[PDB]
Amino acid sequence: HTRMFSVWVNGVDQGDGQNVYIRTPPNTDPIKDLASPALACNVKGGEPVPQFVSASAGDKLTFEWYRVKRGDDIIDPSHSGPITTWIAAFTSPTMDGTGPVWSKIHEEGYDASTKSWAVDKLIANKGMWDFTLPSQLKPGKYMLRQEIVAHHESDATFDKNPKRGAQFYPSCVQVDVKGVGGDAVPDQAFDFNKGYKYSDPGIAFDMYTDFDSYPIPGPPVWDA
Numbered sequence: 001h002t003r004m005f006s007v008w009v010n011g012v013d014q015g016d017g018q019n020v021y022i023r024t025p026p027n028t029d030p031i032k033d034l035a036s037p038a039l040a041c042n043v044k045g046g047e048p049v050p051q052f053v054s055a056s057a058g059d060k061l062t063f064e065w066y067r068v069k070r071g072d073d074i075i076d077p078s079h080s081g082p083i084t085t086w087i088a089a090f091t092s093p094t095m096d097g098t099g100p101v102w103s104k105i106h107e108e109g110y111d112a113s114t115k116s117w118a119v120d121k122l123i124a125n126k127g128m129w130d131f132t133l134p135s136q137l138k139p140g141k142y143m144l145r146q147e148i149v150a151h152h153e154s155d156a157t158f159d160k161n162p163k164r165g166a167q168f169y170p171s172c173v174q175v176d177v178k179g180v181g182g183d184a185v186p187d188q189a190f191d192f193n194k195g196y197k198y199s200d201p202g203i204a205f206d207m208y209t210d211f212d213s214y215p216i217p218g219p220p221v222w223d224a
């Protein structure tokens with residue numbers, strides 16, 4: 001249970017973005033049903049918010065998370081797992097991020113050297129999660145999506161035991177990208193409802209074993 005407070009551009013807080021440039025869900029509840037339309041942008045994914053984060057291709061974005069109040073414990077430490085960041089064209093205001101539209105731009109899973117998950121690092125860094133917009137990105141409006149997946153109950157799948165299963169915490173953010181000479185259009189065209197499956201070893205995952213690797217769902221980070 002966690003959601004976003006605000007976005008920072010090159011270390012500058014843009015200010016409370018909830019229902020401003022973030023499509024904020026009404027609460028911190030997870031999505032579990034891989035068939036749910038809310039898997040992409042959460043329960044209010046389809047409702048436009050009025051503002052777009054102003055950023056340039058190449059900029060460092062920080063997404064700030066919290067649990068109950070800004071600056072708190074961010075997420076219960078039981079909720080180990082990966083954090084992935086995606087981008088899609090902003091097709092129209094009432095897009096909900098369903099369909100074959102996404103490209104992965106950043107990921108962290110499990111680091112065997114430090115036995116540390118992305119979620120451990122999120123907590124240690126007070127809910128600040130950093131990534132770069134590709135400098136080649138063609139200028140225009142995009143939806144950015146950042147997802148925390150918690151695996152504390154992933155040792156069963158939702159289709160078999162609906163009380164358990166992977167927990168997805170997606171957050172979609174509206175961004176208006178200034179170009180720096182790039183022409184690249186993200187083209188993985190990944191579709192969460194089709195591409196995430198209960199058979200996926202990174203979804204049907206037992207975090208309570210000796211493993212030293214975690215397979216992050218979806219394609220590798222988009223290139224060129």
Ligand SMILES: OC[C@H]1O[C@@H](O[C@H]2[C@H](O)[C@@H](O)[C@H](O[C@H]3[C@H](O)[C@@H](O)[C@H](O[C@H]4[C@H](O)[C@@H](O)[C@H](O)O[C@@H]4CO)O[C@@H]3CO)O[C@@H]2CO)[C@H](O)[C@@H](O)[C@@H]1O
Pocket residue numbers: 001075076078079152153155208
């Ligand atoms: O399954 C084998 C494995 O189990 C390990 O124990 C797990 C439990 O399996 C799992 O159910 C449990 O889930 C907790 C979770 O850790 C909490 O963070 C969460 O807290 C919620 C709360 O339920 C909500 O009411 C509230 O609104 O939000 C908070 C989060 O902010 O509650 C769930 C339900 O129990 O996690 C356990 C690990 O901590 C064993 O440890 C292991 O030995 C077994 O092999």
Ligand SMILES: [Cu+2]
Pocket residue numbers: 001002030076079150167
């Ligand atoms: Cu939770």
